[PDB]
Every structure is written in structure tokens, then in C-alpha cells.
């Protein structure tokens, strides 16, 4: 089946973070040393920052953002630059939806934006691949789970939002959207393997559940005014995907009834899948050719399998076609997660830049 396009998030634009004067001033008082013994280490971290905030849009930009995020934790453990702390300096980033600069004298604000950009870059890497190879499907699934993990970590360990693009209602939308796209990649994988029809139906039902939570978030008035046109572009794709994968789920439920020799049940599920897919086609008006190619392929599957099932039942089996309400819905199978973020993993961080400052 042709693959649907994916949503990705833009990275935030960074401003100034003059940590050099503050760090040199704190080592002189508190640690009692000459600040100019740390010129080479302050240059290391600034170079690290300029490369983290002007990060290349590939797989290793993630290891650069991770390294800088971990070294920020190292620095804060040795120099107090948090909110209200002795050596805090202004941290400036641009809020994504307004384009306005927001400043906080808190190093945890810098970590929040770096972590936000980690998840956003993962969402770009997940959405860039064509997912034609099983290996491309696996990297997209991991990327979306990593994006969900960064936004989830950001929503828990920074419970007060430094800017509205990182509030908990927006972050929850981001996690639910990234988990739906991760689950969607796994749905592609389970269908390429030719797994059992019931299992595929459970996986596809979970894709619907994630996108329904993202849709409910996008229908909240607070979210729509902040995202602007973005809310209208995302939801048009999400609403259509809700019905598309609802059709995919019932198509595989009808294939299970076929294996169960319930041919009256099989017509009912195929009829439901075709109705939901026709709804997806109607909601997909104006969508790019990637979306339409996927819907045209799926209709060839569902359309022919519905006609053949009704023909077999009307002429061979004569089994009662149940209404859709009388048969139990498909329970989703959540197999994807926000994958955890360890900021201070020494393997991704390398040595502590300021290890000498004791």
C-alpha cells in the first residue's frame, strides 16, 4: 500500500545565552580559581551551542543536541544558573507560533528548548523517509517514538511552560500525534509481514485511538487560536486518517470473519470499511497525491473484497448480515512508546567539559 505523508514539527530559533561572563565570575568567588584557566572549556561549550542551535537536519544532529543537553546538566550541577540562582543569565528563544522572542534567566529554559528541538528534529527524520523498505519503516517508527519521548520528558520535568508552544496541552497533542505516526509505521510493518488479520486490526484500531486524541486536542478552542492555519492543516489530515485507519481495521476484521467462516459477518465488516473509506476520501479533498494514491489503492482492496463477499453470501452461503452495532468493537494494541530520554548518558555526552571545576 502507498504510504501516507507524516506531520513534522519545526525547530525553535535560539537567541543569546551569555554564560561566559557569569561562569568566570562564579569560579572566582566560589571556587577560588583564576577564571582564565577555563577559556578552552568555555569555548568548547559555546562551539557546542552554536552547532546545536544551527544543527544539521540529519541523524547526527540528534547526537549533537543530546550532547549539548547533557553538558548543560553538567554545567548547572557545577554553576548555579537556574531560576533565581546566583549565576543565572538571560536565555532567549523564539516561540514557534508567534515568532516572538521570550527571555528567561534560567538555564532550564535553554534545556527545554534544546529538548524541544530534539523531538522536533526526530519528527522531521521520521517524516522524511519514503518507508518503502522495512528498514526505512523501522527508522521512522523509532524516530517518532523518540520525538514522543522528548515531548513527554519535556512535559513532565518542566511542568510550568516557559512559552505557550511548550504548554502541557500542546505537548500532549505532540506526543499523541507522534505515537499515532509511530503506531502507523508499525501498522505498515505488520501488513508487510502478512500477520494475522485480527492482530493487524488491533494495531490499526490503536492508530485511530491516538489520532482521535490528537483531533480532540486540535478541536479545543485554545489550541486552534494559537496554532492558526496549522490547526486547520493538521486536523484535515488527522480527521481523514481517523476514518482511513478505521476502514483498515474493519477490513481486517472482515478477513478474520472470513477465516472464521462467518460470511454474514464478513459482509458487514467489509461494508463498514467501505463506508469509512468513502468518508476518508471525502475528507481528503485537496490533499496531495500521496494521500490520494493511498486511498485509491485501498479502495481497490476494499471495493473488490466487499463485492466478492456480498456475491458469495447472496449466492452460496445465505448467511445473515448483522448490523454493525451488534458486534464488539476492536480494542487497540498499544505497541509504541515515548522512548525514554536519558540526558546524562556518558556515551552520548562524552566527558564532562567542566570536570576540572571542583
Amino acid at each position: 500500500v502507498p504510504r501516507m505523508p507524516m506531520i513534522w514539527l519545526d525547530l525553535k530559533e535560539a537567541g543569546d545565552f551569555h554564560f561566559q561572563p557569569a561562569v568566570k565570575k562564579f569560579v572566582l568567588k566560589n571556587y577560588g580559581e583564576n577564571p582564565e584557566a577555563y577559556n578552552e572549556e568555555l569555548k568548547k561549550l559555546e562551539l557546542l551551542r552554536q552547532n546545536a542551535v544551527r544543527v544539521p537536519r540529519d541523524f547526527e544532529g540528534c547526537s549533537v543536541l543530546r550532547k549539548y543537553l547533557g553538558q548543560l546538566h553538567y554545567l548547572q550541577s557545577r554553576v548555579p544558573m537556574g531560576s533565581g540562582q546566583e549565576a543565572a543569565v538571560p536565555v532567549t528563544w523564539t516561540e514557534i507560533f508567534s515568532g516572538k522572542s521570550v527571555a528567561h534567566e534560567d538555564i532550564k529554559y535553554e534545556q527545554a528548548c534544546i529538548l524541544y528541538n530534539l523531538g522536533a528534529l526526530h519528527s522531521m527524520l521520521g517524516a522524511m523517509d519514503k518507508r518503502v523498505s522495512e528498514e526505512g519503516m523501522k527508522v521512522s517508527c523509532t524516530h517518532f517514538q523518540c520525538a514522543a519521548g522528548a515531548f513527554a520528558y519535556l512535559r513532565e520535568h518542566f511542568p510550568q511552560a516557559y512559552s505557550v508552544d511548550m504548554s502541557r496541552q500542546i505537548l500532549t497533542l505532540n506526543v499523541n500525534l507522534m505515537l499515532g505516526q509511530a503506531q502507523e509505521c508499525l501498522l505498515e510493518k505488520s501488513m508487510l509481514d502478512n500477520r494475522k488479520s485480527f492482530l493487524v486490526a488491533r494495531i490499526s484500531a490503536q492508530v485511530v485511538d491516538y489520532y482521535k486524541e490528537a483531533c480532540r486536542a486540535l478541536e479545543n478552542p485554545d489550541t486552534a487560536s494559537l496554532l492558526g492555519r496549522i490547526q486547520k492543516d493538521w486536523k484535515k489530515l488527522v480527521q481523514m486518517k481517523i476514518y482511513y485507519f478505521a476502514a483498515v481495521a474493519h477490513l481486517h476484521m472482515g478477513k478474520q470473519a472470513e477465516e472464521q467462516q462467518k460470511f454474514g459477518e464478513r459482509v458487514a465488516y467489509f461494508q463498514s470499511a467501505l463506508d469509512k473509506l468513502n468518508e476518508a476520501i471525502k475528507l481528503a479533498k485537496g490533499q496531495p497525491d500521496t494521500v490520494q494514491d493511498a486511498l485509491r489503492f485501498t479502495m481497490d482492496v476494499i471495493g473488490g473484497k466487499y463485492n466478492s463477499a456480498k456475491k458469495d453470501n447472496d449466492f452460496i452461503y445465505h448467511e445473515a448480515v448483522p448490523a454493525l452495532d451488534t458486534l464488539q468493537p476492536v480494542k487497540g494494541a498499544p505497541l509504541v512508546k515515548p522512548l525514554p530520554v536519558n540526558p546524562t548518558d556518558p556515551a552520548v555526552t562524552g566527558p564532562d567539559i567542566f570536570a576540572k571545576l571542583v
Binding site: 517508527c141 508499525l186 505488520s190
Partner: peptide, 11 residues
């Protein structure tokens, strides 16, 4: 059967 294969696949 298959879910133990896909659970490792997802990570």
C-alpha cells in the same frame, strides 16, 4: 506469536 517479534521491532 507475532507480537513478541514486533515488540523488539518497535525498538
Amino acid at each position: 506469536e507475532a507480537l513478541k517479534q514486533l515488540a523488539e521491532w518497535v525498538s
